[PDB]
Amino acid sequence: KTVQVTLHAVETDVAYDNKGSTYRAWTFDGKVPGPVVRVTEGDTVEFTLINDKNSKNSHSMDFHAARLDVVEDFESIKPGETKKYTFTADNPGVFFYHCGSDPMIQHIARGMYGVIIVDPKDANALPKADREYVLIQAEHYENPDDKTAMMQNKWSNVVFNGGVFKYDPVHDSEATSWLQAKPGERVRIYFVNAGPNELSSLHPIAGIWDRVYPSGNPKNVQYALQSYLIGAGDAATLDLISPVEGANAIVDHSMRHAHSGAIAVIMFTNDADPEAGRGENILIR
Amino acid sequence: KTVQVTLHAVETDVAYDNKGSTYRAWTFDGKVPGPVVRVTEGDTVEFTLINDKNSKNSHSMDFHAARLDVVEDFESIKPGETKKYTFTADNPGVFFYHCGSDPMIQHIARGMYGVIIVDPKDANALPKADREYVLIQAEHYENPDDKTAMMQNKWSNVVFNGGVFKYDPVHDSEATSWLQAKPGERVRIYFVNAGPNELSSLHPIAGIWDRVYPSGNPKNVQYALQSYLIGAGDAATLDLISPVEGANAIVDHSMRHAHSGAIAVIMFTNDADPEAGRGENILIR
Amino acid sequence: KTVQVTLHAVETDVAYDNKGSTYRAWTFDGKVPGPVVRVTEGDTVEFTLINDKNSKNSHSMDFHAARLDVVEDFESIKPGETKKYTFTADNPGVFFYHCGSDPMIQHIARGMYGVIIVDPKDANALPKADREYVLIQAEHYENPDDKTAMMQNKWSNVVFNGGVFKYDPVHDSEATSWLQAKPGERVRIYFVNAGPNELSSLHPIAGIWDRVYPSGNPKNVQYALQSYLIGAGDAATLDLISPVEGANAIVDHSMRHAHSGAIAVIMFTNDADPEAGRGENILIR
Ligand SMILES: [Cl-]
Ligand SMILES: [Cl-]
Ligand SMILES: [Cu+2]
Ligand SMILES: [Cu+2]
Ligand SMILES: [Cu+2]
Ligand SMILES: [Cu+2]
Ligand SMILES: [Cu+2]
Ligand SMILES: [Cu+2]
Numbered sequence A, B, C: 001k002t003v004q005v006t007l008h009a010v011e012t013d014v015a016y017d018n019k020g021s022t023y024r025a026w027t028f029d030g031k032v033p034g035p036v037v038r039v040t041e042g043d044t045v046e047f048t049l050i051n052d053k054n055s056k057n058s059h060s061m062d063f064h065a066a067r068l069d070v071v072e073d074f075e076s077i078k079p080g081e082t083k084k085y086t087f088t089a090d091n092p093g094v095f096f097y098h099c100g101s102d103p104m105i106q107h108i109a110r111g112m113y114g115v116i117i118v119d120p121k122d123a124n125a126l127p128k129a130d131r132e133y134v135l136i137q138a139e140h141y142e143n144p145d146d147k148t149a150m151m152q153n154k155w156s157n158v159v160f161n162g163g164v165f166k167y168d169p170v171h172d173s174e175a176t177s178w179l180q181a182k183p184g185e186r187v188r189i190y191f192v193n194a195g196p197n198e199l200s201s202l203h204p205i206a207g208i209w210d211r212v213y214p215s216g217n218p219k220n221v222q223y224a225l226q227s228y229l230i231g232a233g234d235a236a237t238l239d240l241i242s243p244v245e246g247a248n249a250i251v252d253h254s255m256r257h258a259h260s261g262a263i264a265v266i267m268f269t270n271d272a273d274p275e276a277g278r279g280e281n282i283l284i285r
Helices: A104-109 A147-151 A255-260 B104-109 B147-151 B255-259 C104-109 C147-151 C255-259
Strands: A002-015 A022-028 A037-040 A044-051 A082-088 A093-098 A113-119 A131-140 A157-160 A179-181 A187-195 A200-205 A209-214 A222-225 A228-230 A234-240 A246-252 A263-268 B002-015 B022-028 B037-040 B044-051 B082-088 B093-098 B113-119 B131-140 B157-160 B179-181 B187-195 B200-205 B209-214 B222-225 B228-230 B234-240 B246-252 B263-268 C002-015 C022-028 C037-040 C044-051 C082-088 C093-098 C113-119 C131-140 C157-160 C179-181 C187-195 C200-205 C209-214 C222-225 C228-230 C234-240 C246-252 C263-268
Touching: A093 A104, A093 A187, A093 A234, A104 A131, A104 A147, A104 C255, A113 A131, A113 A187, A131 A179, A147 C255, A157 A255, A187 A200, A187 A228, A200 A234, A228 A234, A246 A255, A255 B104, A255 B147, B093 B104, B093 B187, B093 B234, B104 B131, B104 B147, B113 B131, B113 B187, B131 B179, B187 B200, B187 B228, B228 B234, B246 B255, B255 C104, B255 C147, C093 C104, C093 C187, C093 C234, C104 C131, C104 C147, C113 C131, C113 C187, C131 C179, C157 C255, C187 C200, C187 C228, C200 C234, C228 C234, C246 C255
Parallel strands: A002 A044, A037 A113, A131 A187, A179 A263, B002 B044, B037 B113, B131 B187, B179 B263, C002 C044, C037 C113, C131 C187, C179 C263
Antiparallel strands: A002 A022, A044 A082, A093 A113, A131 A157, A187 A234, A200 A228, A200 A246, A209 A222, A209 A234, A246 A263, B002 B022, B044 B082, B093 B113, B131 B157, B187 B234, B200 B228, B200 B246, B209 B222, B209 B234, B246 B263, C002 C022, C044 C082, C093 C113, C131 C157, C187 C234, C200 C228, C200 C246, C209 C222, C209 C234, C246 C263
């Protein structure tokens, strides 16, 4: 089928921790990360980017699910300009999308990143998921304007979905979000490493990845991995099943990353919220 | 079968190089790395952790081979406390174990790590190995109390099995240990990257990895790799076969890691010790 | 069949950027990277290394395609001396070669690196390539004598084939080289991360990797990957097909690397040069 996706380049203040601390973010649609885009393999995506008039910077859009021309299709547009392009989603899986404007390092770091999920045309290529969660890793830099610190990889925090310990009520008592499932259910994690610089060695504490799909593609399946390496600008699908009640903690096992904020708690309870990990609750804000 | 495994959390001085330099380590059973735990797939592991009365810190245990609750099972216990939990080793392969107490970065860095090997229920899933060797990579930090240096990733050395150039008599004249095999033998390396922070690009100089199993799982088999990436908190099984007499040098090919201590020499000779890499000489201490 | 390979350890000045800046380099045959070596699976390689009399340092050779003894075969020879060894290429794919003399970190960093390509015995194992290109990533250091800076991972640029923005004329107008292909053609990238320290997260901007082969081995085939991690001292074979005219940008997606010069542009035009990416044009100099 054909789908219309319109997104705005919005420069606004967003919270980045549990105590309500804000920063001057560059965003898609006024939020970090950007909205989840979900299509089926083979779908035609008609995309539109509107750079808001009140922006002070040129912005662009790069989809990893797209096969196009970088020069003309991914070009930067001025504040008050509108850009359009069309692409088919040829390959199934999970894909990084982000702004590609100069310098990309700053545009990604300030929050211009998201995920596009491409469902396989064969609905039985992947085992049925009972829950779905989007987690995007990024480095937070204290000063959004300091490009030298970004080049020197001097980040302040490594975060999931734009928030320091966003999904960690165990470590941060002021956290208000966490992942939910029942024991026995298959939990599908759509993981993207936005970077711009760092690695992610993703591990579920007190559990194991039942299956891992590099770029989310069914052909690339790997089994019973304790950890998986997701490089900067890469994405993967990871499945998790708990045999018991309690919790797992999804972490970047490079410990200084985890200590700085990269920990997500998933609670396995018999009375789990039926709306959690389903419908439009896949990325928890 | 049911296997009883008991470990003590011991805070003691251990050597970290060949010149006899020591540091105040946190350990399992007073050694770095901790004891090798070996079971068969499907076994019931009854685990017990005793935190020694003379310890000054709380300690815990995290098995990557276990599927449990992080909150209750992997909880910190005080000195003079004893903790028990039971898990089944559901998946075959090679798994990282470590203390999971606060801060996890420091508990690992000070030496609280080890390996649990889970032999496949099907004894013919893996090709017959003639030698077996455990190698665990970790970063050594000059001051075990300086948590800022750990967060900044400012290690002094990258080491195998707790010692600077522990298995390299070629570079270090004070090194007494090395790996042994005969030409044509299949040498199985159980590799764990304990971290806490760094990645490992493992390569056998003058050799090639015959087979590589991500997380040690046979289903994930990879053929004839020159190098394999093991992330922090990850593990893999790697097979090596030399057609000639002489030596190979297993290195972390990120050369600043290798230069700082991450080189292990395997000698291929016809008069190789029949006890080497067998029984319980698999982790050479 | 048997092939003769002779290389000279040459210490001479070479350019490393588009503005013509030079540095005192250590090289094979007087160029960075060294010459492309190409054989077939099963071929016997009779290798010869000559260290030039005007050289100030000892040099050696390490082939990742060779299964030998590190002590005798990969030994360092003094200026004016000659080293000879013979090996078979037992495994097909793409392999890193470099000098392995002390300190190995400096010898690699100063330019003593290249690639040996081993074509599969089964000519059908890989789908037919219409274009072939060699890209070798390395770090450039401002002062080639500063071993401490190399040990601290303090590089100036992350480069492809020795040059800062060598294949990026869109970003840098003084760049005189770029990759060429037609739409629909299969472009095969033989990629090597020489390091000596850094990791690469290779992604084609506005494209996708059709197939990826770890170590270049057909048995390890991966499909439709947006990115692929190549550790230091590792190599991979990556296929790229563009459905349309325009451009793609092959980048190390760790943005600090890409911003420092790790971007290579491939132009997809209907009348692309028929000599490009074929014969001896595979490594553009
Ligand atoms: Cl032991
Ligand atoms: Cl045991
Ligand atoms: Cu932007
Ligand atoms: Cu990207
Ligand atoms: Cu501890
Ligand atoms: Cu762990
Ligand atoms: Cu050299
Ligand atoms: Cu090498």
